[PDB]
Amino acid sequence: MFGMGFSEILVIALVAILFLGPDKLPEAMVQIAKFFNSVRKT
C-alpha cells in the first residue's frame, strides 16, 4: 500500500510465524489487539 505488495505481507507473516513460533505469537496477537483497542477508546 505504501511500497509493500501482497507478497511483502506474506513474507512478513512468514518471518513472524517462523520466529515468534508456536508460543509468543498468541502473546503478540493479544498485545497487538490490546494496543489496537487502546487507541480506539482514547
Partner: protein, 239 residues
C-alpha cells in the same frame, strides 16, 4: 493545551521551509558541479569496463530516456543538496522546540549526540562515495559486459546513487546510536538478544517500506539490516 505548541511549531516549520528553499536555490546555482560529482564514479567505471572489454575483444555512456530527464535530475539533485544544506537550520529549529522539555541532566548529551551522528553520517557518505562505489560500480558493470551494452540513464542512476549514499550514511549511524545508548546505559546484550524475534519482523517491515514491491529487494535490503543488528549486538557486548 496544543495552542502554544502549535503557535511555536508553525514559526519553526516556516523557518525550516525557508532554509530548504534557499538551499535549493543555492544548489541549483551549482547544479552542474553536483551532477559532475555524482556522475564521476559512473564515468570512471564505464571507462574501465570499456578498457577491459576492448582488451578482451582484441559502447556505453550516460544517457537520458526522458525528455525532461535532465531538468528533473538537476532539480532532484538540487533539492537533495538543499535539504542537506538546510539540515543545520532544521536541526537547530528542532532543538529549540524540544530544548525546554529536556531536563538539564540529558541536555548535555544531545549536542554531543548530534555532533557524533552528523560526523558519522558524513563519514558514511564519504566512505560510500570514495571506497565502496569505485569497486561496486565497476563490478556491477563488468557483470553484464559480455552480454549487454550498459546504456545507463541518469534518471534511475541518480536515485540509485542517492539511495546508496543515504543508506550507507544511516548504516554508520546505527552502530553509533547503539554505542551512545550503551555508554549511558539503557540496554544490554541480553535485551538486544531476546528482542531479536520482533526485531526481525520490524526489519522486514522496514525493508518492505524502503524497497519496491519485489520480494527480492526486500531480502536484499533486510540482509544488511540483520548484519547491522549483529554488529550492534557485538558493540553492546564489548562495552
Amino acid at each position: 493545551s496544543m495552542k502554544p505548541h502549535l503557535a511555536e511549531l508553525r514559526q519553526r516549520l516556516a523557518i525550516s521551509v525557508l532554509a530548504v528553499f534557499v538551499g535549493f536555490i543555492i544548489a541549483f546555482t551549482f547544479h552542474n558541479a553536483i551532477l559532475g560529482w555524482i556522475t564521476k564514479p559512473l564515468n570512471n567505471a564505464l571507462i574501465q569496463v570499456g578498457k577491459i572489454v576492448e582488451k578482451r575483444e582484441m559502447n556505453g555512456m550516460i544517457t537520458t530516456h526522458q525528455v525532461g530527464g535532465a531538468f528533473f535530475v538537476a532539480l532532484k539533485v538540487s533539492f537533495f543538496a538543499g535539504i542537506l544544506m538546510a539540515m543545520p537550520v532544521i536541526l537547530w529549529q528542532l532543538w529549540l522546540f524540544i530544548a525546554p522539555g529536556l531536563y538539564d541532566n540529558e541536555k548535555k548529551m544531545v549536542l554531543p549526540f548530534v555532533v557524533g551522528g552528523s560526523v558519522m553520517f558524513l563519514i558514511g557518505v564519504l566512505f560510500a562515495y570514495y571506497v565502496v562505489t569505485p569497486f561496486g560500480f565497476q563490478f556491477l558493470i563488468t557483470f553484464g559486459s559480455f552480454l549487454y551494452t550498459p546504456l545507463i540513464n541518469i534518471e534511475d542512476y541518480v536515485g540509485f546513487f542517492t539511495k546508496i549514499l543515504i543508506g550507507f550514511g544511516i548504516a554508520f549511524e546505527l552502530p553509533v546510536v547503539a554505542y551512545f545508548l550503551a555508554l549511558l546505559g539503557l540496554i544490554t546484550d541480553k535485551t538486544l538478544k531476546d528482542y531479536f524475534k520482533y526485531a526481525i519482523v520490524i526489519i522486514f517491515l522496514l525493508a518492505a517500506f524502503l524497497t519496491p514491491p519485489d520480494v527480492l529487494t526486500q531480502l536484499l535490503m533486510a540482509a544488511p539490516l540483520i548484519l547491522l543488528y549483529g554488529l550492534s549486538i557485538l558493540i553492546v557486548h564489548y562495552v
